[PDB]
Amino acid sequence: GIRMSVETIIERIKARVGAVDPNGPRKVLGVFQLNIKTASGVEQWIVDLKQLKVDQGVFASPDVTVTVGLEDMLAISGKTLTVGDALKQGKIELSGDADLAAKLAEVI
Amino acid sequence: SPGIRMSVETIIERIKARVGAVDPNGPRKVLGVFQLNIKTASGVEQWIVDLKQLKVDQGVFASPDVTVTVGLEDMLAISGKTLTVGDALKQGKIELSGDADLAAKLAEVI
Numbered sequence: 001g002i003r004m005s006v007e008t009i010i011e012r013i014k015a016r017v018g019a020v021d022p023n024g025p026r027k028v029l030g031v032f033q034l035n036i037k038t039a040s041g042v043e044q045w046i047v048d049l050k051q052l053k054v055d056q057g058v059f060a061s062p063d064v065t066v067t068v069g070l071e072d073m074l075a076i077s078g079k080t081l082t083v084g085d086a087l088k089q090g091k092i093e094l095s096g097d098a099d100l101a102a103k104l105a106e107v108i
Numbered sequence: 109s110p111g112i113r114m115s116v117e118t119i120i121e122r123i124k125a126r127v128g129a130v131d132p133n134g135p136r137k138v139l140g141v142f143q144l145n146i147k148t149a150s151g152v153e154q155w156i157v158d159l160k161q162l163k164v165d166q167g168v169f170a171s172p173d174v175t176v177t178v179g180l181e182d183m184l185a186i187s188g189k190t191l192t193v194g195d196a197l198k199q200g201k202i203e204l205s206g207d208a209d210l211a212a213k214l215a216e217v218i
């Protein structure tokens with residue numbers, strides 16, 4: 001169901017963010033607003049890659065905003081859908097800083 | 109060098125063919141000016157792809173919506189259908205700045 005699916009994707013993002021070495025080489029320093037479209041409503045999360053924290057909310061001036069459907073997120077996570085294909089199919093909506101967006105695409 | 113010249117001309121002819129194909133009054137979602145910087149061994153080839161007016165010109169635009177910096181061989185492969193824009197990004201082959209919405213809308217239309 002929706003809640004288990006959302007919880008799963010968020011825990012996976014939290015694991016990846018926690019795996020970053022704060023002092024190691026880093027390219028993606030920004031705050032990402034994540035809007036997850038679900039059949040029930042939108043789940044709103046803040047992925048702060050500068051401070052390395054993931055919190056629920058809507059950040060005031062995110063560097064990048066990402067809006068994507070839940071099922072597509074799960075597909076990208078399990079590698080049944082590539083980011084380039086998701087892009088080609090118009091499955092991701094972005095606003096904000098193109099540089100930070102491109103650098104994110106490189107590390108997913 | 110002739111090899112570089114032919115590759116650049118081919119890239120630009122292809123972009124011009126594509127932009128000339130667009131119906132000015134049909135559905136359009138990529139309305140912006142893209143600065144295209146193509147790195148070669150002979151220096152940077154600088155081109156303005158204006159998708160608002162649907163013109164391609166050599167030059168450096170003062171304030172483009174998106175700047176795209178890409179190597180010659182990668183840009184050749186992208187224009188020749190052998191490298192997808194998507195895989196280019198994943199591989200870190202494109203440098204972007206500016207408007208993410210317009211960058212993504214462009215990745216959708218090719």
Ligand SMILES: CCCCCCCCCCCCCCCC(=O)O
Pocket residue numbers: 013016017020025026027028029032033034047049066107108
């Ligand atoms: C909110 C945008 C969509 C979801 C963001 C994906 C987050 C998954 C984990 C990202 C790991 C970032 C790697 C950082 C290393 C670096 O800065 O170079």
Ligand SMILES: CCCCCCCCCCCCCCCC(=O)O
Pocket residue numbers: 012013016066068073076077078083092094101102104105108197211212
């Ligand atoms: C212009 C480039 C767009 C880049 C944005 C890519 C989409 C970000 C959201 C994809 C979800 C990835 C989360 C999966 C986390 C994981 O399983 O490791």
Ligand SMILES: CCCCCCCCCCCCCCCC(=O)O
Pocket residue numbers: 123126127130135136137138139142144157159176193214217218
């Ligand atoms: C960013 C990678 C390379 C960029 C080079 C631009 C490629 C030529 C652009 C042609 C796209 C024309 C389609 C636009 C129609 C529309 O606005 O919906």
